[PDB]
mmCIF file of all heavy atoms in Angstrom:
data_model
loop_
_atom_site.group_PDB
_atom_site.id
_atom_site.type_symbol
_atom_site.label_atom_id
_atom_site.label_comp_id
_atom_site.label_asym_id
_atom_site.label_seq_id
_atom_site.Cartn_x
_atom_site.Cartn_y
_atom_site.Cartn_z
ATOM 1 N N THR A 80 137.791 -42.383 -44.990
ATOM 2 C CA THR A 80 136.707 -42.777 -45.838
ATOM 3 C C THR A 80 135.393 -42.927 -45.118
ATOM 4 O O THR A 80 134.420 -42.396 -45.693
ATOM 5 C CB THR A 80 137.071 -44.227 -46.384
ATOM 6 O OG1 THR A 80 137.155 -45.187 -45.282
ATOM 7 C CG2 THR A 80 138.371 -44.142 -47.225
ATOM 8 N N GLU A 81 135.326 -43.388 -43.874
ATOM 9 C CA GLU A 81 134.053 -43.510 -43.150
ATOM 10 C C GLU A 81 133.823 -42.112 -42.531
ATOM 11 O O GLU A 81 134.375 -41.629 -41.526
ATOM 12 C CB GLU A 81 134.161 -44.519 -42.060
ATOM 13 C CG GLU A 81 134.205 -45.923 -42.641
ATOM 14 C CD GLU A 81 135.281 -46.802 -41.973
ATOM 15 O OE1 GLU A 81 136.101 -46.211 -41.091
ATOM 16 O OE2 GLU A 81 135.211 -48.011 -42.068
ATOM 17 N N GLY A 82 132.829 -41.387 -43.139
ATOM 18 C CA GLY A 82 132.499 -40.071 -42.804
ATOM 19 C C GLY A 82 131.840 -39.358 -43.941
ATOM 20 O O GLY A 82 132.284 -39.347 -45.070
ATOM 21 N N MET A 83 130.477 -39.033 -43.756
ATOM 22 C CA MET A 83 129.638 -38.642 -44.889
ATOM 23 C C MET A 83 129.110 -37.271 -44.689
ATOM 24 O O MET A 83 128.116 -36.942 -45.282
ATOM 25 C CB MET A 83 128.485 -39.732 -45.033
ATOM 26 C CG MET A 83 128.052 -40.300 -43.672
ATOM 27 S SD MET A 83 126.685 -41.506 -43.957
ATOM 28 C CE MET A 83 126.536 -42.144 -42.252
ATOM 29 N N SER A 84 129.708 -36.355 -44.161
ATOM 30 C CA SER A 84 129.473 -34.913 -44.014
ATOM 31 C C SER A 84 130.192 -34.108 -45.134
ATOM 32 O O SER A 84 130.969 -34.832 -45.870
ATOM 33 C CB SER A 84 129.950 -34.351 -42.677
ATOM 34 O OG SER A 84 131.253 -33.858 -42.713
ATOM 35 N N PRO A 85 129.941 -32.966 -45.378
ATOM 36 C CA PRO A 85 130.536 -32.057 -46.261
ATOM 37 C C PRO A 85 131.968 -31.619 -45.993
ATOM 38 O O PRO A 85 132.594 -30.846 -46.694
ATOM 39 C CB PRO A 85 129.632 -30.702 -46.302
ATOM 40 C CG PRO A 85 128.439 -31.121 -45.650
ATOM 41 C CD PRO A 85 128.749 -32.182 -44.773
ATOM 42 N N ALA A 86 132.519 -32.020 -44.807
ATOM 43 C CA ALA A 86 133.847 -31.771 -44.348
ATOM 44 C C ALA A 86 134.809 -32.766 -44.956
ATOM 45 O O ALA A 86 134.387 -33.953 -45.260
ATOM 46 C CB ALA A 86 133.961 -31.770 -42.852
ATOM 47 N N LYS A 87 136.041 -32.375 -45.218
ATOM 48 C CA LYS A 87 137.085 -33.386 -45.606
ATOM 49 C C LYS A 87 137.832 -33.741 -44.334
ATOM 50 O O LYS A 87 138.142 -32.700 -43.593
ATOM 51 C CB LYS A 87 137.948 -32.804 -46.637
ATOM 52 C CG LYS A 87 137.218 -32.767 -48.017
ATOM 53 C CD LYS A 87 138.116 -32.063 -49.052
ATOM 54 C CE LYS A 87 137.532 -32.174 -50.391
ATOM 55 N NZ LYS A 87 136.452 -31.228 -50.613
ATOM 56 N N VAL A 88 138.109 -34.886 -44.124
ATOM 57 C CA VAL A 88 138.876 -35.361 -42.892
ATOM 58 C C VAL A 88 140.076 -36.085 -43.356
ATOM 59 O O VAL A 88 139.971 -37.063 -44.089
ATOM 60 C CB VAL A 88 138.073 -36.139 -41.891
ATOM 61 C CG1 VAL A 88 138.904 -36.556 -40.695
ATOM 62 C CG2 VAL A 88 136.890 -35.320 -41.463
ATOM 63 N N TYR A 89 141.347 -35.738 -42.848
ATOM 64 C CA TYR A 89 142.569 -36.343 -43.169
ATOM 65 C C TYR A 89 143.309 -36.697 -41.966
ATOM 66 O O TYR A 89 143.534 -35.899 -40.995
ATOM 67 C CB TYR A 89 143.388 -35.387 -44.088
ATOM 68 C CG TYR A 89 142.862 -34.909 -45.285
ATOM 69 C CD1 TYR A 89 142.290 -33.661 -45.463
ATOM 70 C CD2 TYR A 89 142.794 -35.642 -46.437
ATOM 71 C CE1 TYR A 89 141.699 -33.175 -46.608
ATOM 72 C CE2 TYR A 89 142.176 -35.366 -47.604
ATOM 73 C CZ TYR A 89 141.706 -33.989 -47.747
ATOM 74 O OH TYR A 89 141.077 -33.619 -48.828
ATOM 75 N N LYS A 90 143.682 -38.012 -41.944
ATOM 76 C CA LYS A 90 144.575 -38.462 -40.895
ATOM 77 C C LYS A 90 146.030 -38.244 -41.212
ATOM 78 O O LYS A 90 146.348 -38.534 -42.460
ATOM 79 C CB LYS A 90 144.382 -39.907 -40.608
ATOM 80 C CG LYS A 90 145.341 -40.522 -39.542
ATOM 81 C CD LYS A 90 145.134 -42.035 -39.463
ATOM 82 C CE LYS A 90 145.704 -42.534 -38.064
ATOM 83 N NZ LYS A 90 145.258 -43.852 -37.684
ATOM 84 N N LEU A 91 146.860 -37.617 -40.400
ATOM 85 C CA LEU A 91 148.268 -37.265 -40.726
ATOM 86 C C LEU A 91 149.076 -38.158 -39.873
ATOM 87 O O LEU A 91 149.107 -38.045 -38.631
ATOM 88 C CB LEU A 91 148.432 -35.671 -40.431
ATOM 89 C CG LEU A 91 147.637 -34.851 -41.336
ATOM 90 C CD1 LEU A 91 147.695 -33.357 -40.926
ATOM 91 C CD2 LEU A 91 147.772 -35.048 -42.773
ATOM 92 N N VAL A 92 149.834 -39.031 -40.508
ATOM 93 C CA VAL A 92 150.561 -40.027 -39.869
ATOM 94 C C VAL A 92 152.084 -39.584 -39.694
ATOM 95 O O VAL A 92 152.734 -39.528 -40.663
ATOM 96 C CB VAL A 92 150.533 -41.455 -40.581
ATOM 97 C CG1 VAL A 92 151.287 -42.443 -39.882
ATOM 98 C CG2 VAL A 92 149.055 -41.822 -40.952
ATOM 99 N N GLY A 93 152.405 -39.362 -38.499
ATOM 100 C CA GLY A 93 153.820 -38.962 -38.226
ATOM 101 C C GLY A 93 154.679 -39.920 -37.476
ATOM 102 O O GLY A 93 154.147 -41.082 -37.193
ATOM 103 N N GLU A 94 155.863 -39.640 -37.153
ATOM 104 C CA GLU A 94 156.841 -40.484 -36.597
ATOM 105 C C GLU A 94 156.427 -40.893 -35.237
ATOM 106 O O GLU A 94 156.596 -42.138 -34.702
ATOM 107 C CB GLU A 94 158.212 -39.918 -36.674
ATOM 108 C CG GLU A 94 159.310 -40.761 -35.869
ATOM 109 C CD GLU A 94 159.684 -42.092 -36.620
ATOM 110 O OE1 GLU A 94 159.527 -42.142 -37.928
ATOM 111 O OE2 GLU A 94 160.057 -43.015 -35.971
ATOM 112 N N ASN A 95 155.857 -39.997 -34.464
ATOM 113 C CA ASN A 95 155.490 -40.198 -33.032
ATOM 114 C C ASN A 95 154.087 -39.932 -32.592
ATOM 115 O O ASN A 95 153.711 -40.154 -31.442
ATOM 116 C CB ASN A 95 156.387 -39.179 -32.187
ATOM 117 C CG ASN A 95 157.929 -39.362 -32.433
ATOM 118 O OD1 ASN A 95 158.436 -40.334 -31.918
ATOM 119 N ND2 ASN A 95 158.550 -38.444 -33.153
ATOM 120 N N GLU A 96 153.238 -39.552 -33.489
ATOM 121 C CA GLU A 96 151.798 -39.348 -33.157
ATOM 122 C C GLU A 96 151.079 -39.114 -34.514
ATOM 123 O O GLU A 96 151.804 -38.809 -35.570
ATOM 124 C CB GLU A 96 151.740 -38.179 -32.289
ATOM 125 C CG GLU A 96 151.686 -36.778 -32.914
ATOM 126 C CD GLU A 96 153.098 -36.236 -33.214
ATOM 127 O OE1 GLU A 96 153.914 -36.213 -32.279
ATOM 128 O OE2 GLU A 96 153.470 -35.876 -34.431
ATOM 129 N N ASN A 97 149.836 -39.260 -34.505
ATOM 130 C CA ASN A 97 148.935 -38.816 -35.549
ATOM 131 C C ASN A 97 148.273 -37.547 -35.298
ATOM 132 O O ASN A 97 147.833 -37.364 -34.256
ATOM 133 C CB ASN A 97 147.893 -39.944 -35.888
ATOM 134 C CG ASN A 97 148.529 -41.268 -36.153
ATOM 135 O OD1 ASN A 97 149.474 -41.437 -36.876
ATOM 136 N ND2 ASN A 97 147.858 -42.351 -35.656
ATOM 137 N N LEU A 98 147.956 -36.761 -36.355
ATOM 138 C CA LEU A 98 147.168 -35.559 -36.221
ATOM 139 C C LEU A 98 145.945 -35.802 -37.269
ATOM 140 O O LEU A 98 145.943 -36.614 -38.047
ATOM 141 C CB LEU A 98 147.874 -34.290 -36.538
ATOM 142 C CG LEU A 98 149.234 -34.177 -35.983
ATOM 143 C CD1 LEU A 98 149.910 -32.850 -36.481
ATOM 144 C CD2 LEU A 98 149.224 -34.147 -34.468
ATOM 145 N N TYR A 99 144.989 -34.953 -36.947
ATOM 146 C CA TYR A 99 143.805 -34.941 -37.902
ATOM 147 C C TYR A 99 143.668 -33.471 -38.380
ATOM 148 O O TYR A 99 143.782 -32.517 -37.682
ATOM 149 C CB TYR A 99 142.473 -35.391 -37.289
ATOM 150 C CG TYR A 99 142.545 -36.924 -37.249
ATOM 151 C CD1 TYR A 99 143.142 -37.663 -36.311
ATOM 152 C CD2 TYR A 99 141.909 -37.701 -38.200
ATOM 153 C CE1 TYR A 99 143.113 -39.013 -36.281
ATOM 154 C CE2 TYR A 99 141.847 -39.017 -38.265
ATOM 155 C CZ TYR A 99 142.505 -39.735 -37.177
ATOM 156 O OH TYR A 99 142.478 -41.039 -37.238
ATOM 157 N N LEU A 100 143.344 -33.472 -39.674
ATOM 158 C CA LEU A 100 143.032 -32.071 -40.277
ATOM 159 C C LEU A 100 141.669 -32.180 -40.953
ATOM 160 O O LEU A 100 141.323 -33.150 -41.683
ATOM 161 C CB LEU A 100 144.083 -31.803 -41.417
ATOM 162 C CG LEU A 100 143.822 -30.642 -42.408
ATOM 163 C CD1 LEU A 100 143.623 -29.307 -41.668
ATOM 164 C CD2 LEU A 100 144.904 -30.561 -43.509
ATOM 165 N N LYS A 101 140.737 -31.155 -40.536
ATOM 166 C CA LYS A 101 139.374 -31.261 -41.004
ATOM 167 C C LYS A 101 139.030 -29.942 -41.625
ATOM 168 O O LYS A 101 139.393 -28.889 -41.158
ATOM 169 C CB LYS A 101 138.557 -31.489 -39.735
ATOM 170 C CG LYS A 101 136.997 -31.723 -40.113
ATOM 171 C CD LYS A 101 136.245 -32.158 -38.887
ATOM 172 C CE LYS A 101 134.767 -32.348 -39.283
ATOM 173 N NZ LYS A 101 134.080 -32.944 -38.005
ATOM 174 N N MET A 102 138.339 -29.973 -42.857
ATOM 175 C CA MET A 102 138.244 -28.738 -43.691
ATOM 176 C C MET A 102 136.819 -28.687 -44.201
ATOM 177 O O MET A 102 136.257 -29.631 -44.543
ATOM 178 C CB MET A 102 139.139 -28.739 -44.846
ATOM 179 C CG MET A 102 140.632 -28.828 -44.461
ATOM 180 S SD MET A 102 141.726 -29.532 -45.788
ATOM 181 C CE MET A 102 141.570 -28.204 -47.072
ATOM 182 N N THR A 103 136.173 -27.515 -44.103
ATOM 183 C CA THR A 103 134.910 -27.162 -44.831
ATOM 184 C C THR A 103 135.003 -26.067 -45.690
ATOM 185 O O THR A 103 135.746 -25.001 -45.343
ATOM 186 C CB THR A 103 133.697 -26.977 -43.721
ATOM 187 O OG1 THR A 103 134.127 -26.059 -42.773
ATOM 188 C CG2 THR A 103 133.422 -28.345 -43.053
ATOM 189 N N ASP A 104 134.278 -25.989 -46.763
ATOM 190 C CA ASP A 104 134.346 -24.803 -47.596
ATOM 191 C C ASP A 104 133.346 -23.756 -47.262
ATOM 192 O O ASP A 104 132.534 -23.887 -46.337
ATOM 193 C CB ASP A 104 134.008 -25.185 -49.126
ATOM 194 C CG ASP A 104 132.661 -25.650 -49.358
ATOM 195 O OD1 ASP A 104 131.817 -24.761 -49.659
ATOM 196 O OD2 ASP A 104 132.439 -26.896 -49.436
ATOM 197 N N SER A 105 133.489 -22.549 -47.872
ATOM 198 C CA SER A 105 132.724 -21.431 -47.576
ATOM 199 C C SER A 105 131.231 -21.568 -47.628
ATOM 200 O O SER A 105 130.451 -20.784 -46.931
ATOM 201 C CB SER A 105 133.199 -20.132 -48.427
ATOM 202 O OG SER A 105 133.096 -20.658 -49.866
ATOM 203 N N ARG A 106 130.810 -22.411 -48.409
ATOM 204 C CA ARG A 106 129.388 -22.637 -48.462
ATOM 205 C C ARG A 106 128.691 -22.931 -47.089
ATOM 206 O O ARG A 106 127.530 -22.680 -46.829
ATOM 207 C CB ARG A 106 128.969 -23.689 -49.475
ATOM 208 C CG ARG A 106 129.239 -23.347 -50.949
ATOM 209 C CD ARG A 106 129.080 -24.551 -51.798
ATOM 210 N NE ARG A 106 129.746 -25.697 -51.324
ATOM 211 C CZ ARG A 106 129.672 -26.993 -51.754
ATOM 212 N NH1 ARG A 106 128.911 -27.166 -52.784
ATOM 213 N NH2 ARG A 106 130.446 -27.925 -51.236
ATOM 214 N N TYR A 107 129.520 -23.599 -46.195
ATOM 215 C CA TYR A 107 129.057 -23.994 -44.915
ATOM 216 C C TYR A 107 129.428 -23.064 -43.756
ATOM 217 O O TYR A 107 129.156 -23.398 -42.589
ATOM 218 C CB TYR A 107 129.568 -25.455 -44.663
ATOM 219 C CG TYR A 107 128.925 -26.454 -45.663
ATOM 220 C CD1 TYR A 107 129.582 -26.824 -46.767
ATOM 221 C CD2 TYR A 107 127.623 -26.919 -45.387
ATOM 222 C CE1 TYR A 107 128.956 -27.764 -47.667
ATOM 223 C CE2 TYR A 107 127.058 -27.847 -46.283
ATOM 224 C CZ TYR A 107 127.833 -28.202 -47.461
ATOM 225 O OH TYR A 107 127.261 -29.135 -48.311
ATOM 226 N N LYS A 108 129.936 -21.945 -44.134
ATOM 227 C CA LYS A 108 130.293 -20.980 -43.152
ATOM 228 C C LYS A 108 128.999 -20.618 -42.389
ATOM 229 O O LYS A 108 128.019 -20.279 -42.803
ATOM 230 C CB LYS A 108 130.841 -19.704 -43.781
ATOM 231 C CG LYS A 108 131.083 -18.458 -42.826
ATOM 232 C CD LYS A 108 132.430 -18.407 -42.255
ATOM 233 C CE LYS A 108 132.531 -17.071 -41.294
ATOM 234 N NZ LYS A 108 131.576 -17.086 -40.218
ATOM 235 N N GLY A 109 129.084 -20.658 -40.980
ATOM 236 C CA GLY A 109 127.961 -20.216 -40.153
ATOM 237 C C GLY A 109 126.990 -21.371 -39.738
ATOM 238 O O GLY A 109 126.132 -21.172 -38.965
ATOM 239 N N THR A 110 127.143 -22.525 -40.484
ATOM 240 C CA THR A 110 126.317 -23.586 -40.127
ATOM 241 C C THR A 110 127.001 -24.525 -39.137
ATOM 242 O O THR A 110 128.172 -24.400 -38.764
ATOM 243 C CB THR A 110 126.038 -24.431 -41.427
ATOM 244 O OG1 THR A 110 127.122 -25.259 -41.795
ATOM 245 C CG2 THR A 110 125.663 -23.597 -42.583
ATOM 246 N N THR A 111 126.248 -25.448 -38.619
ATOM 247 C CA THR A 111 126.798 -26.361 -37.648
ATOM 248 C C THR A 111 127.723 -27.446 -38.343
ATOM 249 O O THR A 111 128.129 -28.484 -37.694
ATOM 250 C CB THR A 111 125.690 -27.136 -36.950
ATOM 251 O OG1 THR A 111 124.805 -27.718 -37.821
ATOM 252 C CG2 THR A 111 124.875 -26.109 -36.049
ATOM 253 N N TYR A 112 127.930 -27.276 -39.616
ATOM 254 C CA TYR A 112 129.016 -28.079 -40.247
ATOM 255 C C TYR A 112 130.382 -27.331 -40.243
ATOM 256 O O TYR A 112 131.414 -27.837 -40.383
ATOM 257 C CB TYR A 112 128.646 -28.337 -41.743
ATOM 258 C CG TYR A 112 127.464 -29.122 -41.992
ATOM 259 C CD1 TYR A 112 126.281 -28.606 -42.485
ATOM 260 C CD2 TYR A 112 127.513 -30.586 -41.752
ATOM 261 C CE1 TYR A 112 125.101 -29.340 -42.661
ATOM 262 C CE2 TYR A 112 126.489 -31.437 -41.952
ATOM 263 C CZ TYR A 112 125.235 -30.756 -42.517
ATOM 264 O OH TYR A 112 124.107 -31.537 -42.674
ATOM 265 N N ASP A 113 130.317 -26.041 -40.000
ATOM 266 C CA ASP A 113 131.379 -25.065 -40.057
ATOM 267 C C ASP A 113 132.520 -25.566 -39.191
ATOM 268 O O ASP A 113 132.368 -25.428 -37.927
ATOM 269 C CB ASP A 113 130.894 -23.607 -39.717
ATOM 270 C CG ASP A 113 131.984 -22.499 -40.056
ATOM 271 O OD1 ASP A 113 133.117 -22.949 -40.341
ATOM 272 O OD2 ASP A 113 131.713 -21.349 -39.825
ATOM 273 N N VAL A 114 133.653 -25.984 -39.711
ATOM 274 C CA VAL A 114 134.818 -26.331 -38.943
ATOM 275 C C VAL A 114 135.301 -25.235 -37.978
ATOM 276 O O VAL A 114 135.927 -25.509 -37.026
ATOM 277 C CB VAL A 114 135.917 -26.830 -39.873
ATOM 278 C CG1 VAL A 114 137.249 -26.277 -39.517
ATOM 279 C CG2 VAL A 114 135.993 -28.347 -39.775
ATOM 280 N N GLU A 115 135.134 -23.965 -38.347
ATOM 281 C CA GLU A 115 135.439 -22.904 -37.403
ATOM 282 C C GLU A 115 134.598 -22.889 -36.162
ATOM 283 O O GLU A 115 135.072 -22.668 -35.022
ATOM 284 C CB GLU A 115 135.263 -21.501 -38.064
ATOM 285 C CG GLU A 115 135.729 -20.299 -37.186
ATOM 286 C CD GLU A 115 135.904 -18.925 -37.864
ATOM 287 O OE1 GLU A 115 135.558 -18.987 -39.009
ATOM 288 O OE2 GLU A 115 136.319 -17.932 -37.235
#
């Protein structure tokens, strides 16, 4: 919830660790928001 950029950020809660998944759409390709 705390995060105000164009990216979506998801915490992935597992049995032994957490992961994070972060995603941006094509509009932001090439910018400093670009998750790639």
